[PDB]
Amino acid sequence: AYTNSFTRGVYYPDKVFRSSVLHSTQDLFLPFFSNVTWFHAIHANPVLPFNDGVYFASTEKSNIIRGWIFGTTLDSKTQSLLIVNNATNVVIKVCEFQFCNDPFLGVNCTFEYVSFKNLREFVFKNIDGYFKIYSKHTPINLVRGLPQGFSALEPLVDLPIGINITRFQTLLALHAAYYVGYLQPRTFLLKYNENGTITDAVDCALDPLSE
Amino acid sequence: TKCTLKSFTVEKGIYQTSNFRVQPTESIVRFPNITNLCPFGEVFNATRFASVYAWNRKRISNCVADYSVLYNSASFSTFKCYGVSPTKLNDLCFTNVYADSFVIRGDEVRQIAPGQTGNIADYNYKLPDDFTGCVIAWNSNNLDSKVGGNYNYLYRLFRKSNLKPFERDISTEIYQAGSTPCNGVKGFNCYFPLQSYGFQPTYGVGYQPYRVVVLSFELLHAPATVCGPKKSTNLVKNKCVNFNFNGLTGTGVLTESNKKFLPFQQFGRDIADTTDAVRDPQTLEILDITPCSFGGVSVITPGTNTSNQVAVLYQGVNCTEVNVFQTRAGCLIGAEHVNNSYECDIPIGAGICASYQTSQSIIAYTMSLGVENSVAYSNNSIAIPTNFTISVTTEILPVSMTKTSVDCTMYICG
Amino acid sequence: YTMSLGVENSVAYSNNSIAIPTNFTISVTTEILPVSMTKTSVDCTMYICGDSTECSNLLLQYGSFCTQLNRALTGIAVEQDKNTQEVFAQVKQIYKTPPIKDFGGFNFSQILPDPSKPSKRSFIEDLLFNKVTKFNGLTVLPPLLTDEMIAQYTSALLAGTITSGWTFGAGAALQIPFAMQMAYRFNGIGVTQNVLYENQKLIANQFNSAIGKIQDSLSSTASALGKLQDVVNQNAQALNTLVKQLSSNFGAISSVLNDILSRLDKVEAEVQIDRLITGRLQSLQTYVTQQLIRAAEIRASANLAATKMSECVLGQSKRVDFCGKGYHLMSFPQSAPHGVVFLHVTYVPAQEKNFTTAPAICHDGKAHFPREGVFVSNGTHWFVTQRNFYEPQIITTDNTFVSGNCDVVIGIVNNTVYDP
Amino acid sequence: SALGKLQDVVNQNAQALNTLVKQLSSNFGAISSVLNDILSRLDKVEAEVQIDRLITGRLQSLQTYVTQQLIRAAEIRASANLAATKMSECVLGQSKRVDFCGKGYHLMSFPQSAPHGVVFLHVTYVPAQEKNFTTAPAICHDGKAHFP
Amino acid sequence: DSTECSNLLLQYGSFCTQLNRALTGIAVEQDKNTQEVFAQVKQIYKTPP
Numbered sequence A: 001a002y003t004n005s006f007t008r009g010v011y012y013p014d015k016v017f018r019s020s021v022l023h024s025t026q027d028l029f030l031p032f033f034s035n036v037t038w039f040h041a042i043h044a045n046p047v048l049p050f051n052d053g054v055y056f057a058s059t060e061k062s063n064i065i066r067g068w069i070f071g072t073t074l075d076s077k078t079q080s081l082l083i084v085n086n087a088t089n090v091v092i093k094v095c096e097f098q099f100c101n102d103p104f105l106g107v108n109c110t111f112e113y114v115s116f117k118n119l120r121e122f123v124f125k126n127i128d129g130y131f132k133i134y135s136k137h138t139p140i141n142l143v144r145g146l147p148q149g150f151s152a153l154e155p156l157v158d159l160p161i162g163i164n165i166t167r168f169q170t171l172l173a174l175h176a177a178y179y180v181g182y183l184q185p186r187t188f189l190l191k192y193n194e195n196g197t198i199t200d201a202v203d204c205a206l207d208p209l210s211e
Numbered sequence B: 001t002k003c004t005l006k007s008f009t010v011e012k013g014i015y016q017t018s019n020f021r022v023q024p025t026e027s028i029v030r031f032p033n034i035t036n037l038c039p040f041g042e043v044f045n046a047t048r049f050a051s052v053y054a055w056n057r058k059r060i061s062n063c064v065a066d067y068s069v070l071y072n073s074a075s076f077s078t079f080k081c082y083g084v085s086p087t088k089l090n091d092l093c094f095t096n097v098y099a100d101s102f103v104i105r106g107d108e109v110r111q112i113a114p115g116q117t118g119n120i121a122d123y124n125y126k127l128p129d130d131f132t133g134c135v136i137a138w139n140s141n142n143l144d145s146k147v148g149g150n151y152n153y154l155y156r157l158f159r160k161s162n163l164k165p166f167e168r169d170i171s172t173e174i175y176q177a178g179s180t181p182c183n184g185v186k187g188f189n190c191y192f193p194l195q196s197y198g199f200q201p202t203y204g205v206g207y208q209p210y211r212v213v214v215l216s217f218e219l220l221h222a223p224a225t226v227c228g229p230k231k232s233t234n235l236v237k238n239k240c241v242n243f244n245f246n247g248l249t250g251t252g253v254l255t256e257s258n259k260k261f262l263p264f265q266q267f268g269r270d271i272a273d274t275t276d277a278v279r280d281p282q283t284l285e286i287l288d289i290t291p292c293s294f295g296g297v298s299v300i301t302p303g304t305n306t307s308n309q310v311a312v313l314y315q316g317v318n319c320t321e322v323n324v325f326q327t328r329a330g331c332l333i334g335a336e337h338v339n340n341s342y343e344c345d346i347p348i349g350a351g352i353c354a355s356y357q358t359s360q361s362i363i364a365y366t367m368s369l370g371v372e373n374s375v376a377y378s379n380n381s382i383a384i385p386t387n388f389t390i391s392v393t394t395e396i397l398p399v400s401m402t403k404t405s406v407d408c409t410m411y412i413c414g
Numbered sequence C: 001y002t003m004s005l006g007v008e009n010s011v012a013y014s015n016n017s018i019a020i021p022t023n024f025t026i027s028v029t030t031e032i033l034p035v036s037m038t039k040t041s042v043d044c045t046m047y048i049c050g051d052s053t054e055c056s057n058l059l060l061q062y063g064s065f066c067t068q069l070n071r072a073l074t075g076i077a078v079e080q081d082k083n084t085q086e087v088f089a090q091v092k093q094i095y096k097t098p099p100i101k102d103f104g105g106f107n108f109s110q111i112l113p114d115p116s117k118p119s120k121r122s123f124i125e126d127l128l129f130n131k132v133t134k135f136n137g138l139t140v141l142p143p144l145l146t147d148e149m150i151a152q153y154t155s156a157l158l159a160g161t162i163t164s165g166w167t168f169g170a171g172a173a174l175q176i177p178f179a180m181q182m183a184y185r186f187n188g189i190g191v192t193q194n195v196l197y198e199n200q201k202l203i204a205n206q207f208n209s210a211i212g213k214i215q216d217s218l219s220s221t222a223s224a225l226g227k228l229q230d231v232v233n234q235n236a237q238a239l240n241t242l243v244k245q246l247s248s249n250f251g252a253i254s255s256v257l258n259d260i261l262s263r264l265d266k267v268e269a270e271v272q273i274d275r276l277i278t279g280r281l282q283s284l285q286t287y288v289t290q291q292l293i294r295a296a297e298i299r300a301s302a303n304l305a306a307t308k309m310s311e312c313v314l315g316q317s318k319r320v321d322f323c324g325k326g327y328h329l330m331s332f333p334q335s336a337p338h339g340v341v342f343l344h345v346t347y348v349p350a351q352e353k354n355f356t357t358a359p360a361i362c363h364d365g366k367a368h369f370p371r372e373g374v375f376v377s378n379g380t381h382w383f384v385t386q387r388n389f390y391e392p393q394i395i396t397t398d399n400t401f402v403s404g405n406c407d408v409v410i411g412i413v414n415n416t417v418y419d420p
Numbered sequence D: 001s002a003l004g005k006l007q008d009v010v011n012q013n014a015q016a017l018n019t020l021v022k023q024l025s026s027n028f029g030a031i032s033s034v035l036n037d038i039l040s041r042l043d044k045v046e047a048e049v050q051i052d053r054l055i056t057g058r059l060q061s062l063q064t065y066v067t068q069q070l071i072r073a074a075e076i077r078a079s080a081n082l083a084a085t086k087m088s089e090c091v092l093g094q095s096k097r098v099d100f101c102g103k104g105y106h107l108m109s110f111p112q113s114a115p116h117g118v119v120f121l122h123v124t125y126v127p128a129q130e131k132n133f134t135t136a137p138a139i140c141h142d143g144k145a146h147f148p
Numbered sequence E: 001d002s003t004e005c006s007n008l009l010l011q012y013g014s015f016c017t018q019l020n021r022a023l024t025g026i027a028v029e030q031d032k033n034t035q036e037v038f039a040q041v042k043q044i045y046k047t048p049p
């Protein structure tokens, strides 16, 4: 099943303060007003492609999604990035430590790290084998679809793991829904206000008026 | 002024000589509050590295090192750098360094350079075209070469596709190019994916083994974690200084500010794409890197045929920030302010003009637009002239400038 | 769609028909001209090298480029004041208004200075100021004449025009009653001066309404300032482009000059920095060349504005369409940011009527021609009128002159000429 | 110093050529400013690197001169068309155009030649001794209005 | 139409947009010149038969 990206999937392209400027950059972004997938957060959590990078979101009552796996095979035949939450930290491993092959839990050490109503949004991209994570959380204003209006995702993590990725999957803690779309190389115009803050954007390739 | 104009005579005028800048009183060094020694010396003493298709990496962070001894050291048979000079490394800091290492024949050490191609660069260890880093290597024939051959070092001879920059790929899957089915064994057009160097002590100095280390530097928007062997100063504020934040360097006032850097932001920029502010990595405060508080200097003078006396306008500078007068154009020094107004002699700006007047001094005044007159108008009165004067007015116009010609071959070459 | 060139009109020509206007409208067509663009200066050593001594000693190897670019912008900057003098400072005395406004019903209070303002612009000058909207060795310099001075020259030129006609543009200003001044403006366009005095209330009410429309036009129509706002936008866009070129690599490894100096060493640093110097210098030559060309455009506009000041304001111009459309009566200058605005008052004829006409009238064998004016008939009565407003006189030996016998003229008509 | 508008044409072009000659003293990043040094110190393959820096600099310097002469010649042409208009209207005529043919009411003009230009002696009538009179727009006689 | 050249040309920055702008400003001005010379008449008059 499908829905639409609207203005979502914007994030700060670097840790630099710019202010009172309509700055521009070319980077991976989620294309504006583009078609994206939607799923229930149950059982409906299959293997997916990753492509160059992912926009992920989920609408959840008490956070039911508690991890993700990224890699070529996702199956502990080779090191594959496992991202997890333990209710006090984010926990990250690349190990052949196999989670349930039916992808939920009812409640090799070559790299490791530790730090509907809730909408969580995440953006993921891999550059030089390093994995970069951006995110934002909000209360919902729509019960099933994605929010139409603007918000910029914040930087969370950048880990120099050195790993190839082509696929991913999401993992559930049980006794909600999620959305997936892919980034493309795009030129964007970014509305930095006085407060160091991107307040709006234009996807320059969206339409002839955007050009 | 005489030097700006390249002459000993200066006519009555205002001349744009120079530019006032508040000078850097002292240098200021702001590395992170870190100690420890980086493990490069551990890598330089390792018992072996991996076969090059499986090349090792060590991440370097939270530490300092002296690089200057390394390119002087008799321990190394080759040292190179790209995007950095080895001479400059002791002055720098990095967000990370990665030391990448392997053993290969000396004839293949040439592939450890930016944007290369061939079986190492394509199928074992790719460096990008714009690689910022250094390379260290030593002939290891004394450690790594043996009678009949040391076969324990190998390289990928073949792959289906070329590696991305820093892609690591350890699986030795058979190189089936032809119809000959792989089935986990060698065949014609289905070759073994590796080869062994088999290093023998009879090998020539290029075909001999070399141990290699690649120093992959990065300095990012994210702050430094690695540095050269230089200590921080304490901070200085609201005075001009020659600053150094992790190698981000220049001349300027470290101005106290409330510039609203979001919690993740580390540096800020002017629209020229040059730094206007930084977070101090020890104080964790948003220092605006104000420049030398600059302002153009303009020199007001009567002709040197009249006097050596002179006045100075610091354009856009306030007189508290450089007799003295605050014009709207900038601070004016050496000119006597006057409440009378006169015809404009030397123009300054914003309605001010200056002149040489009484014992003489340069005066400065708001210019007079003309003699004030009220016309004696009323609804039934007319003035009619009873007489005339025949004026003769001289009007002067240019018509034709000098007909030059320049022969471009005789000018450029001759 | 294919654009239309205008409404199509078959003019009713025939060999003995003339149309004469029976009425007029005093139009007040506004015109706007640029006079002086933003003065700038560039300290090229600071722009190119930003106090790097290493870069500054490289820039010495190029010689006179930095001084001749600073010279070219200095030549443009001085000329901006020369334009601003030549347009406004055409009168050597500062004329001031009488206290009491006995101008025969014309209401200049909306275009004369207003004492209520903190800076004493007129009302219409203040609308023109509301309708119009650097850090790297680049600088902006203030003009020599401030807006508080230009607003006095656009008072002196205006109070001269109102109290004294042409005369302040030729000798000492001579007082003349404003209704009589308009009588000599009208007599300058072939309308006989009694057409003013017999209609003075109508002319005052048309003029006061035509001034009132300009306040409503400028209040609603911010696009009316197009020429002046574009001269601001062109200079702002040129400086933003010259600043943003500091970010360009020009084939160096980085555009932050301190990267090359803090990462390479002096042998390689010169090879990289000479790319930035060549690229930033080619960027600054490109800006200064466009400012020299743009200064010639604003100078051509300032010479035109200075000529319209001398002809339309300080006098009355016989030059068709030069001082606004219609027949020119009079013009009032008003100041605006980087420019000048003229309110050209023009007599436009209206309410035509058709008449039968003849080039000559045959009396007792003599051919009579009109002394000034045209012969016309309603169909049976014959009359003579001035050409530009229907005013039928009886035909006489005074308002006509004889030449030759009735045979020679084509289309002459037989009618009796009266002799007083 | 009345002849500033003519003398400045001579001074601007003299300052432009003297600046264009001084540019041959620049190194432009070559090992010497003087091209016979480069040919007498270096072999062909090295000399053709050093000379290419000089050619790049000297050619950029000569394009900078010719571009500013094109601009300056357009400025002089706008003055030559103005002078040709004053010759036609002021000398060969009488001008009705206020403050074009000199200040005052224009009568007549005489052209006089000068180096690089022309000087007009405009002859103008200026009214010069006022009296203040009572006035009226019309005179009433036998109930009829008379106008002058 | 070499992309290999175009990616070097981008390093020279905004020279290319201001060249396309300068020729655009001249090109629009040629329409305005042809407008101001000929379109001085407000209605299309035509002669008698």
Ligand SMILES: *[C@@H]1O[C@H](CO)[C@@H](O)[C@H](O)[C@H]1NC(C)=O
Pocket (backbone or CB within 6 Å): B318, B319, B320, B321, B326
């Ligand atoms: C000049 O600078 C001082 C601060 O040093 C400030 O108080 C004053 O207002 C300034 N005056 C002007 C005209 O800028």
Ligand SMILES: *[C@@H]1O[C@H](CO)[C@@H](O)[C@H](O)[C@H]1NC(C)=O
Pocket (backbone or CB within 6 Å): B338, B339
């Ligand atoms: C100038 O005028 C001000 C009053 O406006 C006065 O305070 C000042 O003393 C005067 N200075 C001179 C030299 O007259």
Ligand SMILES: *[C@@H]1O[C@H](CO)[C@@H](O)[C@H](O)[C@H]1NC(C)=O
Pocket (backbone or CB within 6 Å): B386, B387, B388
């Ligand atoms: C006009 O002025 C001259 C002096 O310029 C004087 O000699 C002459 O008498 C005056 N004429 C009259 C009519 O007053």
Ligand SMILES: *[C@@H]1O[C@H](CO)[C@@H](O)[C@H](O)[C@H]1NC(C)=O
Pocket (backbone or CB within 6 Å): C022, C023, C024
């Ligand atoms: C002339 O036009 C005005 C327009 O307001 C009108 O009031 C006036 O009556 C007209 N004159 C005649 C004679 O119709």
Ligand SMILES: *[C@@H]1O[C@H](CO)[C@@H](O)[C@H](O)[C@H]1NC(C)=O
Pocket (backbone or CB within 6 Å): C101, C107, C109
């Ligand atoms: C002139 O026009 C203004 C328009 O606001 C009006 O207030 C003023 O009373 C008028 N003055 C005269 C003398 O008619």
Ligand SMILES: *[C@@H]1O[C@H](CO)[C@@H](O)[C@H](O)[C@H]1NC(C)=O
Pocket (backbone or CB within 6 Å): C012, C019, C352, C353, C354
């Ligand atoms: C004048 O006469 C012609 C022909 O009858 C007619 O077309 C035109 O409208 C008339 N003009 C006026 C002002 O009545």
Ligand SMILES: *[C@@H]1O[C@H](CO)[C@@H](O)[C@H](O)[C@H]1NC(C)=O
Pocket (backbone or CB within 6 Å): C015, C016, C410, C411
């Ligand atoms: C005007 O035209 C008519 C035909 O329409 C002709 O008979 C007449 O003679 C002409 N009159 C003149 C003065 O040419």
Ligand SMILES: *[C@@H]1O[C@H](CO)[C@@H](O)[C@H](O)[C@H]1NC(C)=O
Pocket (backbone or CB within 6 Å): C362, C414
């Ligand atoms: C005009 O009058 C004369 C004298 O009466 C006569 O000969 C002539 O025929 C008349 N012309 C016309 C057009 O009737």
Ligand SMILES: *[C@@H]1O[C@H](CO)[C@@H](O)[C@H](O)[C@H]1NC(C)=O
Pocket (backbone or CB within 6 Å): B375, B376, B383, C173, C174, C175, D130, D131, D132
């Ligand atoms: C006569 O008019 C002049 C200005 O033209 C003026 O200076 C003078 O005061 C007037 N005389 C009287 C008595 O008003």
